[PDB]
Every structure is written in C-alpha cells, then in structure tokens.
Amino acid sequence: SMKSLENEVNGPLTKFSTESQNDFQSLKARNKFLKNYITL
C-alpha cells in the first residue's frame, strides 16, 4: 500500500511542488527492449 501511494505521488502529481537515471526502476535493462517491438 505504501509503495503504491509513493509511486502515485512520484508520478504525475497535482498542483504544487511542495513535497513532489541509475537506478533505472523504469524497466530499462535494455536487451530486446526496443527490439522486441516490431520496429517496422
């Protein structure tokens, strides 16, 4: 539950900047990442 609310507020946040790269948490171990899409 706390991880879900943390990743909610770290994403697109609401109107202000009060509280609001390695390590690539955002699925970026690039090996057939873009290549597994058909790219044609």
Partner: protein, 48 residues
C-alpha cells in the same frame, strides 16, 4: 625538459559538457536473497 613544450597562456574554450556516464553495469550492486523462515522445515527423527 622537452623541446616540444607548448606555450600559450590562454583559457581553452570548452568542447564537451559533463553528463551522466552511459554505462549500465557496475555502479550497481549484486542482489542477495535470504530469510531464516526457510529454516523452519526440518526432519522428524524416526528410526533411532
């Protein structure tokens, strides 16, 4: 010492900027998995 010995007192103009290095192995660590809850499962001493 050298006869090459470059001689120009002027600030060299900047060529490249400093960015994040484009590597993806080993500034990172090695993952370990362990828990003592696997030590629950033991054997029943039955024969002798």
């Amino acid at each position: 010492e050298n006869s090459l010995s470059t001689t120009s007192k002027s600030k060299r103009q900047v060529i490249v900027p400093v960015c994040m290095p484009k590597i993806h192995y080993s500034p990172l660590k090695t993952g370990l998995c362990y828990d003592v809850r696997m030590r629950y499962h033991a054997k029943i001493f039955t024969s002798y």
